[PDB]
Symmetry: C2
């Protein structure tokens, strides 16, 4: 770990806190490629949430991530039920 690598995790977790139905963000990983960064993560949602709603959630999360940092190129979000065993 280094200080710059921390600022980024702080901003990612900072954006997720905005979303009340996002739970237990984990496997949060960053890759650097030139100027721009690629972000991947798992989130948990109520098992009763529809695929429509969960998909809309990941679209809005990526949108907010890209608005926050001008150096994030893409964000991929895997959706799991609350209390998943991978």
């Amino acid at each position: 770990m280094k200080r710059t690598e921390l600022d980024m995790y702080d901003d990612i977790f900072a954006v997720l806190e905005r979303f009340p139905n996002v739970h237990n963000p984990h496997r949060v990983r960053i890759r650097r490629v030139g100027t721009k960064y690629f972000i991947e993560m798992d989130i948990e949602v109520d098992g009763k949430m529809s695929v429509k709603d969960a998909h809309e959630l990941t679209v809005k999360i990526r949108k907010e991530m890209l608005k926050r940092r001008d150096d994030i190129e893409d964000v991929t979000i895997h959706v799991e039920p609350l209390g998943n065993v991978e």
Copy 2:
């Protein structure tokens, strides 16, 4: 493309046909690493399907994939709503 690369896509698509609520499998990709193969795909499900049910579906699909071919090491499945715009 080569003949051996076809046999594999045939077996993957052959297993998905087993599942009636799996729709429009796409971005179906194979990576070779030594003896064993890594499979990634997108599927579409009814937007009204729960995250619990969709997750259970991907678990059963991976299980059936691994049972069919002894040379598949892992299978990751992305779930989208019917008629998704990536």
